[PDB]
mmCIF file of N, CA and C in Angstrom:
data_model
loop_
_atom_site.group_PDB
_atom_site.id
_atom_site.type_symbol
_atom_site.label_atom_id
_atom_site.label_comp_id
_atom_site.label_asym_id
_atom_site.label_seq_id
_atom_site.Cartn_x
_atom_site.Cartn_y
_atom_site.Cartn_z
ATOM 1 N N UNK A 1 -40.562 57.861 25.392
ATOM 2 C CA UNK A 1 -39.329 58.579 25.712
ATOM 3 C C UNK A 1 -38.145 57.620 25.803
ATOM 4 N N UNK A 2 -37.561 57.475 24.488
ATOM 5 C CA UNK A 2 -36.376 56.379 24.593
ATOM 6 C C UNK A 2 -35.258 56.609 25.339
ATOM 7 N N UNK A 3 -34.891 57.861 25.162
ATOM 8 C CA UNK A 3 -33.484 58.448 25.844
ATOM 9 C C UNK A 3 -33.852 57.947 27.483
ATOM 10 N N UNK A 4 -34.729 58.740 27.748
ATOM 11 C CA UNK A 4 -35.009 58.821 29.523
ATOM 12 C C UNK A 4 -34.852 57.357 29.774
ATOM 13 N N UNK A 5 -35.631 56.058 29.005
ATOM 14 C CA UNK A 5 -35.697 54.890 29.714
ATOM 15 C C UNK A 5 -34.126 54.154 29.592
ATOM 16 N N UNK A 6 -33.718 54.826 28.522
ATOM 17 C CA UNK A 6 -32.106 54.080 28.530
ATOM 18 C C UNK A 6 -31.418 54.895 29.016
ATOM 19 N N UNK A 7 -31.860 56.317 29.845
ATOM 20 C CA UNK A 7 -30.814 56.769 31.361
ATOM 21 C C UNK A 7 -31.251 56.461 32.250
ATOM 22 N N UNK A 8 -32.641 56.070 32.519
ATOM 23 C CA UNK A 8 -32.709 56.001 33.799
ATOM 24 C C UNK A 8 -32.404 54.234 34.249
ATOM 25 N N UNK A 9 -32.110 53.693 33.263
ATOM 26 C CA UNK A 9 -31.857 52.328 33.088
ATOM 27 C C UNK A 9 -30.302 52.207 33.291
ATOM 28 N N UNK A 10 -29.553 53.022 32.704
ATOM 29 C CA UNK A 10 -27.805 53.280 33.213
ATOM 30 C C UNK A 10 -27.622 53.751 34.572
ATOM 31 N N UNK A 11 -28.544 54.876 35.030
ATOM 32 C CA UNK A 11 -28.115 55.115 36.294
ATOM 33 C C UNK A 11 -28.514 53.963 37.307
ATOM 34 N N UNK A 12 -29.595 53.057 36.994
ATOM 35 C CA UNK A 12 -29.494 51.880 38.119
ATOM 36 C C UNK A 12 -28.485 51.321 38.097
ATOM 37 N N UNK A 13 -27.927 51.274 36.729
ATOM 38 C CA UNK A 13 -26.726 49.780 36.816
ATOM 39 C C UNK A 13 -25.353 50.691 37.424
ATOM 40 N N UNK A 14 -24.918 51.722 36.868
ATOM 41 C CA UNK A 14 -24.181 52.331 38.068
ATOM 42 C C UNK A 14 -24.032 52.312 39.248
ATOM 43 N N UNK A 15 -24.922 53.115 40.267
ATOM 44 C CA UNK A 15 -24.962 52.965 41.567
ATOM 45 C C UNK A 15 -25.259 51.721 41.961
ATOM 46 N N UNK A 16 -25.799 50.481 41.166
ATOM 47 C CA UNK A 16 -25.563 48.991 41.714
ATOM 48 C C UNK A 16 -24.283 48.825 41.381
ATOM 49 N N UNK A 17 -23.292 49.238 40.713
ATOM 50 C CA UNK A 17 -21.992 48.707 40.543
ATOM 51 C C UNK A 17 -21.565 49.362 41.068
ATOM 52 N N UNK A 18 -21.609 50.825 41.558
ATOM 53 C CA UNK A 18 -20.839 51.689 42.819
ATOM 54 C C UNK A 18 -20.871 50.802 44.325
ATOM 55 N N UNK A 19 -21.785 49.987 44.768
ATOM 56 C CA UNK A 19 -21.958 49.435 45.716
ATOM 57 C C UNK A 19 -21.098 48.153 45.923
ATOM 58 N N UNK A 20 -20.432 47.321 44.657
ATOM 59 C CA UNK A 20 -19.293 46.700 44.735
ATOM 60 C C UNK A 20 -17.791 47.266 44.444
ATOM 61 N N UNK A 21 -18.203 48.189 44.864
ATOM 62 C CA UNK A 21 -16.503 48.708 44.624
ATOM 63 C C UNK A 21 -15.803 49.859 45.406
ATOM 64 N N UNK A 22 -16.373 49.144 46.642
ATOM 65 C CA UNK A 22 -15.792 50.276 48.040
ATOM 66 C C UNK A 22 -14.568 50.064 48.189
ATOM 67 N N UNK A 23 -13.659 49.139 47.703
ATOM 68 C CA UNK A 23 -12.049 49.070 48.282
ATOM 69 C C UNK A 23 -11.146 49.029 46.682
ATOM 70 N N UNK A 24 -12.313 49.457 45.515
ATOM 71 C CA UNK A 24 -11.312 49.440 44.121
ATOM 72 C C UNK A 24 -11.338 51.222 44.169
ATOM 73 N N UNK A 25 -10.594 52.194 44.510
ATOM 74 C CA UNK A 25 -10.755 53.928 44.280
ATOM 75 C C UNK A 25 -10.779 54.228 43.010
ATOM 76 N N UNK A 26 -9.754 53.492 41.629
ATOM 77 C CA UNK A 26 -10.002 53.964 40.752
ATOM 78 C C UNK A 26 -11.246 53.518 39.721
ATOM 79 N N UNK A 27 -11.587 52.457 40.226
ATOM 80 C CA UNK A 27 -13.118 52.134 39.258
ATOM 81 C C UNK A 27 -13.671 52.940 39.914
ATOM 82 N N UNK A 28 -14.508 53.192 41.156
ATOM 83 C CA UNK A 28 -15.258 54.370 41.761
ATOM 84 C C UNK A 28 -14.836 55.447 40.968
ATOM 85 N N UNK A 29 -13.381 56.209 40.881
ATOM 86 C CA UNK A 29 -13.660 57.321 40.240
ATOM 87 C C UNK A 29 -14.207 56.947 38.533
ATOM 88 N N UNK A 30 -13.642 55.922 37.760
ATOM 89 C CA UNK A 30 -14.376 56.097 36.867
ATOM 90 C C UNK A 30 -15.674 56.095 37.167
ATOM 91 N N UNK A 31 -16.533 54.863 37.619
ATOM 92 C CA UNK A 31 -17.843 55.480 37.850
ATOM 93 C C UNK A 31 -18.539 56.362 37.737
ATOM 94 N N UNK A 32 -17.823 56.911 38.719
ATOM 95 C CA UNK A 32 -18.333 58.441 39.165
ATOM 96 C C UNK A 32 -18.142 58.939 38.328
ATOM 97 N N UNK A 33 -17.194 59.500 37.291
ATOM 98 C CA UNK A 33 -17.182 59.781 35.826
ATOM 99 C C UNK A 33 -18.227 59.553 34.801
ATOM 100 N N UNK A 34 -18.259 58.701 34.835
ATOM 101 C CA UNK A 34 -19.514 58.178 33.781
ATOM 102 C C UNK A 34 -20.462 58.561 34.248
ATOM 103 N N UNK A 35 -20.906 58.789 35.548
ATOM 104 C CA UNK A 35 -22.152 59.320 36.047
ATOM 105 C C UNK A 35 -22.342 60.499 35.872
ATOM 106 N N UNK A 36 -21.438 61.135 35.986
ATOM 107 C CA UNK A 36 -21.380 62.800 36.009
ATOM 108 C C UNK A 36 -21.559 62.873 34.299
ATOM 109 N N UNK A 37 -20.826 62.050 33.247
ATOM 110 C CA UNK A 37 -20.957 62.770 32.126
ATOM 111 C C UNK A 37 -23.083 62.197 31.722
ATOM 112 N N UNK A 38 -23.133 61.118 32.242
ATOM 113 C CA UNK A 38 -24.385 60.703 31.374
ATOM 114 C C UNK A 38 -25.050 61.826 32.474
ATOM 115 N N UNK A 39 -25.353 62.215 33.093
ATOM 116 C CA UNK A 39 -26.089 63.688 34.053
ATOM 117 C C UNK A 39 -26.079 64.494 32.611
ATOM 118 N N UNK A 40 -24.469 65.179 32.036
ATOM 119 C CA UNK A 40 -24.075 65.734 31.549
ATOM 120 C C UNK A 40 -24.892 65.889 30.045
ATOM 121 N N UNK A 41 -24.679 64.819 29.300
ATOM 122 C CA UNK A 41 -25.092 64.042 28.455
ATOM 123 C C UNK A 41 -26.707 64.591 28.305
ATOM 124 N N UNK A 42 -27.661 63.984 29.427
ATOM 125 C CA UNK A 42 -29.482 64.166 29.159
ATOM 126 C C UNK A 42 -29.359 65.765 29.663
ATOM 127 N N UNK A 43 -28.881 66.337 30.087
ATOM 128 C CA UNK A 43 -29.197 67.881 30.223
ATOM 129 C C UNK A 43 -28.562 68.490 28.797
ATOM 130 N N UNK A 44 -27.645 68.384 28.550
ATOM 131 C CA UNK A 44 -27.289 68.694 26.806
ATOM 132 C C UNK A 44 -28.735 67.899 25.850
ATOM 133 N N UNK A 45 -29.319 66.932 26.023
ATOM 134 C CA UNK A 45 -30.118 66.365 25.271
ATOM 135 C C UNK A 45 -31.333 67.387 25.361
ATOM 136 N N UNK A 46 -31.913 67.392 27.038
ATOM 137 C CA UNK A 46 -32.921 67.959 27.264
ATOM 138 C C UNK A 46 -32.809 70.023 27.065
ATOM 139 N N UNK A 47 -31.959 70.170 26.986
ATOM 140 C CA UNK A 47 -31.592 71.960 26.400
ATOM 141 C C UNK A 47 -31.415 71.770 25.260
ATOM 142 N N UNK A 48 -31.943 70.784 24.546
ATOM 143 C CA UNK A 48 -31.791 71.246 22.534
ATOM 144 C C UNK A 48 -30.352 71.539 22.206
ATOM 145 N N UNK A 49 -29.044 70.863 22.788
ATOM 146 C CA UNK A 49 -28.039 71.109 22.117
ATOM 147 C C UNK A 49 -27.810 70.331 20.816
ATOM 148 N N UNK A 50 -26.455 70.126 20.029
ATOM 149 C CA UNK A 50 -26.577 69.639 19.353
ATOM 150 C C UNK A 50 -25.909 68.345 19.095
ATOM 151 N N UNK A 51 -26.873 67.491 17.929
ATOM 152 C CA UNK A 51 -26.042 65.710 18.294
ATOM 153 C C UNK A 51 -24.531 66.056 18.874
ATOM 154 N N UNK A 52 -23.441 66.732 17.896
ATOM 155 C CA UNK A 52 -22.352 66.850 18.369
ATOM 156 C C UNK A 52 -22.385 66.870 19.741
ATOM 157 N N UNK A 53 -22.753 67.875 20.252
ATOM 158 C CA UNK A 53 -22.388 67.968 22.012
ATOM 159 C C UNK A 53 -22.760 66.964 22.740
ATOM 160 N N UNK A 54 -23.475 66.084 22.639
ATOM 161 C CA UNK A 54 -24.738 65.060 23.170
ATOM 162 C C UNK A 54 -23.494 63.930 22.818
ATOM 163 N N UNK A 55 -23.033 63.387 21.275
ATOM 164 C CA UNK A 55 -22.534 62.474 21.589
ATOM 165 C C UNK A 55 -20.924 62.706 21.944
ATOM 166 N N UNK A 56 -20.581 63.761 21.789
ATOM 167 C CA UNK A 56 -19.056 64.317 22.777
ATOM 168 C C UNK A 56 -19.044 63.533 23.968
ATOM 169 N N UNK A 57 -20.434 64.119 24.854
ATOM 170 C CA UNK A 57 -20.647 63.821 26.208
ATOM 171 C C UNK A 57 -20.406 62.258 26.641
ATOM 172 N N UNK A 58 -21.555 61.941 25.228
ATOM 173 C CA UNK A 58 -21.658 60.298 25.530
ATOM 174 C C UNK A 58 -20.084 59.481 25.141
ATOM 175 N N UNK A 59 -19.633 59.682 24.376
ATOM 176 C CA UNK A 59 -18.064 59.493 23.756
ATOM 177 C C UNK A 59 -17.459 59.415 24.969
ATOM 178 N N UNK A 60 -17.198 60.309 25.821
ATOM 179 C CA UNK A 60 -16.531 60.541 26.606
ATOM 180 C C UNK A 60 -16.780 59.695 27.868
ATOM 181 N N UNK A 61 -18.024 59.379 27.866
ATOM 182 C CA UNK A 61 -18.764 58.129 29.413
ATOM 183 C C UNK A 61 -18.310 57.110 28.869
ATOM 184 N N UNK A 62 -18.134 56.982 26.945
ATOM 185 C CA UNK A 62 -18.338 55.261 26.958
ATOM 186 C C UNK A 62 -16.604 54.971 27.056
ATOM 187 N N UNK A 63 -15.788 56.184 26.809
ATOM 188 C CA UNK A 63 -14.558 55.639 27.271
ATOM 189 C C UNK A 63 -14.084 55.527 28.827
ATOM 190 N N UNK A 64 -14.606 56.031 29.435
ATOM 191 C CA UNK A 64 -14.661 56.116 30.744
ATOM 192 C C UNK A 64 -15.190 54.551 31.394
ATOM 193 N N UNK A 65 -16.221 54.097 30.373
ATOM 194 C CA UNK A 65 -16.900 52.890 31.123
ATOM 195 C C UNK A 65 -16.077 51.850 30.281
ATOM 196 N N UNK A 66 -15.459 52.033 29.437
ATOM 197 C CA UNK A 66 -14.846 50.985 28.822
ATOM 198 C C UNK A 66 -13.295 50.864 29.428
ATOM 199 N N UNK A 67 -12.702 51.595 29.936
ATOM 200 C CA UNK A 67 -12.117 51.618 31.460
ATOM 201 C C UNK A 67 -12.118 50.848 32.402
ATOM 202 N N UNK A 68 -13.217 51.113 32.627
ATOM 203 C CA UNK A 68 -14.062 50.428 34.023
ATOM 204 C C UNK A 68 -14.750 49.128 33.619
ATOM 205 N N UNK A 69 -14.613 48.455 33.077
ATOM 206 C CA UNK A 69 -14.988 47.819 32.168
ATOM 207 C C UNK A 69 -13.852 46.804 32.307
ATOM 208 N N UNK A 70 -12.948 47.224 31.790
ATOM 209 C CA UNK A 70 -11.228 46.282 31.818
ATOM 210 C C UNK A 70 -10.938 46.095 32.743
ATOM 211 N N UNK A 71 -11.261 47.152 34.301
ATOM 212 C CA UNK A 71 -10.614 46.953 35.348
ATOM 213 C C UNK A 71 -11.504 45.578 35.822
ATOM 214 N N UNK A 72 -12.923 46.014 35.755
ATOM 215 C CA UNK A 72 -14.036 45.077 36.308
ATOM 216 C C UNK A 72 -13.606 43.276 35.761
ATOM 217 N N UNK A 73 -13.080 43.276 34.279
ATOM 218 C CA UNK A 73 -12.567 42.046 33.942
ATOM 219 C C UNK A 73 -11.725 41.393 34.668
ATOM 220 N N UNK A 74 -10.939 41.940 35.678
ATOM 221 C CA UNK A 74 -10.081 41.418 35.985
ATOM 222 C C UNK A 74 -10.430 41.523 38.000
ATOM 223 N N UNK A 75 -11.311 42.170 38.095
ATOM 224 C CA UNK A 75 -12.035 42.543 40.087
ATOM 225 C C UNK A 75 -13.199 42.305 40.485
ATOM 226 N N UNK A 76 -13.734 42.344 38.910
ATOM 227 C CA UNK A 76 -15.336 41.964 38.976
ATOM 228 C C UNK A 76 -16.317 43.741 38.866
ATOM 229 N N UNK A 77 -17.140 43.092 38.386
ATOM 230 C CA UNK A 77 -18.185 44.484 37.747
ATOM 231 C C UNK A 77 -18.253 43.966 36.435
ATOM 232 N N UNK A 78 -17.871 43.238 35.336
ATOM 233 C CA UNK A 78 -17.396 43.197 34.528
ATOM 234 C C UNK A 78 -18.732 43.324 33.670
ATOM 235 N N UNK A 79 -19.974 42.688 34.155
ATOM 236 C CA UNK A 79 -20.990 42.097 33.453
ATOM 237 C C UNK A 79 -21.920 43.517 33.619
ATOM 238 N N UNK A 80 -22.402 44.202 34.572
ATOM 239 C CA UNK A 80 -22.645 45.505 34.863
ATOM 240 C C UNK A 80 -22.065 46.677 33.920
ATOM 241 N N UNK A 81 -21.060 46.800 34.012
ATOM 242 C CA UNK A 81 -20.095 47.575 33.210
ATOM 243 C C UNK A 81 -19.991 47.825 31.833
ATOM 244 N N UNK A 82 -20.619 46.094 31.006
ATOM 245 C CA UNK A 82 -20.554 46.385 29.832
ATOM 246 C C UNK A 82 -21.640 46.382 29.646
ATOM 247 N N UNK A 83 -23.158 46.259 30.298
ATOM 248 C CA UNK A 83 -24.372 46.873 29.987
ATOM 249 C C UNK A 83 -24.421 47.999 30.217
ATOM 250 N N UNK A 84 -23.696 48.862 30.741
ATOM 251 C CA UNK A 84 -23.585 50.119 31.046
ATOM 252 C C UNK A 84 -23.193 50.726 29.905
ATOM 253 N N UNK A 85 -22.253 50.446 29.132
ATOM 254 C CA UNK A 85 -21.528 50.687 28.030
ATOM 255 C C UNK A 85 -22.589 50.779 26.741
ATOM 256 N N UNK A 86 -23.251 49.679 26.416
ATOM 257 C CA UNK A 86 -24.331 49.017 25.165
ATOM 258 C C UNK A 86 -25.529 50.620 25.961
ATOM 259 N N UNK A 87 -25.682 50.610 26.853
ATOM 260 C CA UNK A 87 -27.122 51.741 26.969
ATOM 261 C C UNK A 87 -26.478 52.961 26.727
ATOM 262 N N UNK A 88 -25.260 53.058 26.964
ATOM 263 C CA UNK A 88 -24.457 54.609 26.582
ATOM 264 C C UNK A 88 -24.224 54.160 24.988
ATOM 265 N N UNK A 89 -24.121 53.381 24.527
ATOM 266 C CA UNK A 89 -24.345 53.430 23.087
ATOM 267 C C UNK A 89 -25.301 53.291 22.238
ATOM 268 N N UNK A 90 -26.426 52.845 22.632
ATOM 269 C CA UNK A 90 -28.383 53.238 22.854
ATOM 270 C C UNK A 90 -28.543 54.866 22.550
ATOM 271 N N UNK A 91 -28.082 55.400 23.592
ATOM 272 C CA UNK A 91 -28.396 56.677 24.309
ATOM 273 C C UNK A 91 -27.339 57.815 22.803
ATOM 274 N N UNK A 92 -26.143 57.151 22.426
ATOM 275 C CA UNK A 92 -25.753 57.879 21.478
ATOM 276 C C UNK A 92 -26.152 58.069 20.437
ATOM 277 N N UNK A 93 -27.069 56.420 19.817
ATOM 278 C CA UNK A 93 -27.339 56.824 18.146
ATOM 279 C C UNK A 93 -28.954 57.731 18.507
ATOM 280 N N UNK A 94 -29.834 57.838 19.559
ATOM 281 C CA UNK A 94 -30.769 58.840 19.916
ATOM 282 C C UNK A 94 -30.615 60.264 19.769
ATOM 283 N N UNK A 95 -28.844 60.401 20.286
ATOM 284 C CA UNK A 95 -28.638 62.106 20.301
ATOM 285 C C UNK A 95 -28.499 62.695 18.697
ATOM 286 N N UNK A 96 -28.923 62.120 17.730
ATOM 287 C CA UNK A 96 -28.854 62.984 15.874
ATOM 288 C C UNK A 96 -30.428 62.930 16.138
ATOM 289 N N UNK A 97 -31.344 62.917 16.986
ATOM 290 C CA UNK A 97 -32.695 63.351 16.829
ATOM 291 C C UNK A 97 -32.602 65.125 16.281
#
C-alpha cells in the first residue's frame, strides 16, 4: 500500500513540525492546511474518485507546503517542510492509479 505509507509518513512529519511552531500563527495555519487537504486527498483516493480530484487535492497541499516551506527558510521547519512537500509529490504521481 504505497499511498497509505507515504500518508502516514506526511502526517508524522507534520504534527512534528506543528510542535515547532507555537509562536509562528501563520505557518500553523498553513500546516493545518496541508493537513486538512492530505485527510482530504486519501479519502478522495480511498472513495474511487478521480486522478483529477486526488491530484487537485494534492496540488493544493503542495502549494500550501511550499508556503510553509519559505516561511520555515527563513524561522526554521525548513528541512521538515520540504520532505513534506517530496511525499505530497510521491502521493500525487500514485493518484492516475
Amino acid at each position: 500500500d504505497e499511498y497509505k505509507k507515504y500518508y502516514q509518513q506526511a502526517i508524522q512529519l507534520i504534527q512534528q513540525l506543528k510542535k515547532a511552531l507555537e509562536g509562528n500563527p501563520e505557518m500553523k495555519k498553513l500546516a493545518d492546511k496541508v493537513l486538512a487537504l492530505l485527510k482530504q486527498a486519501y479519502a478522495a483516493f480511498k472513495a474511487g474518485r478521480s486522478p483529477e480530484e486526488i491530484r487537485a487535492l494534492l496540488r493544493k497541499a503542495i502549494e500550501a507546503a511550499k508556503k510553509l516551506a519559505k516561511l520555515g527558510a527563513s524561522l526554521g521547519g525548513f528541512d521538515l517542510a520540504k520532505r513534506i512537500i517530496e511525499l505530497l509529490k510521491k502521493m500525487y504521481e500514485l493518484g492516475g492509479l
